[PDB]
Amino acid sequence: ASLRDIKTRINATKKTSQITKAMEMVSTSKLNRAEQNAKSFVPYMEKIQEVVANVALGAGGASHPMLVSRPVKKTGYLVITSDRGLAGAYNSNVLRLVYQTIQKRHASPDEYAIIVIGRVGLSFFRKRNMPVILDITRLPDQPSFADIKEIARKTVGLFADGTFDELYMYYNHYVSAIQQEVTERKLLPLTDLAENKQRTVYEFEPSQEEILDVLLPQYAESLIYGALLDAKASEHAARMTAMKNATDNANELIRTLTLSYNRARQAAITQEITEIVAGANAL
């Protein structure tokens, strides 16, 4: 190729590398800001966790351990995806892990139930032939407890009526900046819980079933909020590592191309020297 073309390719790759490095920095800042909320939220979750683990068991209620609660009917699922791209294969896989399980298992298109968090979720469910109840167009990177609050209320209330048999979700939890792992865990029918009793009375002016009905939706919402914060931080980590390795690849290509340009130009230099020498000699 010509030196002119090599120069244009090198300049374009520099410009893309600069964009990617800047976006890596922005993602790093957002990750460092989201970690604070992620660590702060824990006390509120743990309070509700211990109280519900103590009081809810032993009685039937709205979100007590339920089995065969209208078994042939929709079941609540959650799809959590990054609002924007540049995160690598993470957005692709978080859809596929939901798909290969629930779409295959559930035969009738109506008897499952999925709602989505994330901008790209509905953008890809344009391709998907899937029923969506309610959705979020965009979530600010701030914790957004108030915004997701009414949506969690919708999830619990439409878990009620028997429409959703179990609330289920798929989201990724980050071990570190390099590791994110997928979750396939059940939430509402309380198939898993641990005993925490040390109380004789704990705000127990109502009955046990009444306090169960009162308290369980907030437990569900707290777990949803924790999952959402974890997923947002996972998105930050994924985009950061994607920008980092993209910058590394771009700089490798730049090294190769610029060195190629430099090996090429010596041939032109020797050609012009040869021409000058021949012109001088022939006279």
């Binding site: 374009a12 410009k15 893309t16 964009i19 924007r84 791209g85 540049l86």
Partner: protein
């Protein structure tokens, strides 16, 4: 008409570098990308088909004033081709005015003619 066209192409050439990231862009940026794509489609031309200067200025005015912002990019060539026949059949007064006075026709009349044509154009 070319005063705005130069600026639009200049902006599109700048944002073409960021266009590689899909639609994950601020709204004004893909608005300008949509304008630039239609500009590029308009400037396209086939072989041995000279165009009168009045028809050139009319189609450039239509592109640059925003009248083409709702036509899909795949239909711009056909839109221009049908627009020339529409201007031949009706609106000969605009062509005659441009041809004689070398200036743009009355703004109201041209807008009404373009709207009347768009009332007859059919999208794919």
């Amino acid at each position: 008409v070319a005063g705005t066209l130069r600026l639009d192409l200049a902006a599109y050439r700048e944002l073409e570098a960021f266009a590689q990231f899909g639609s994950d862009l601020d709204k004004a940026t893909q608005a300008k990308l949509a304008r630039g794509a239609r500009t590029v489609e308009v400037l396209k031309q086939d072989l041995h088909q000279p165009i009168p200067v009045e028809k050139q200025v009319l189609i450039i005015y239509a592109l640059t004033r925003g009248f083409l912002d709702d036509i899909p990019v795949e239909d711009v060539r056909r839109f221009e081709k049908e627009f020339y026949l529409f201007l031949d059949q009706n609106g000969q007064h605009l062509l005659e005015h441009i041809r004689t006075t070398k200036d743009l026709p009355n703004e109201d009349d041209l807008n009404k003619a373009i709207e009347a044509f768009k009332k007859t154009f059919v999208v794919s």
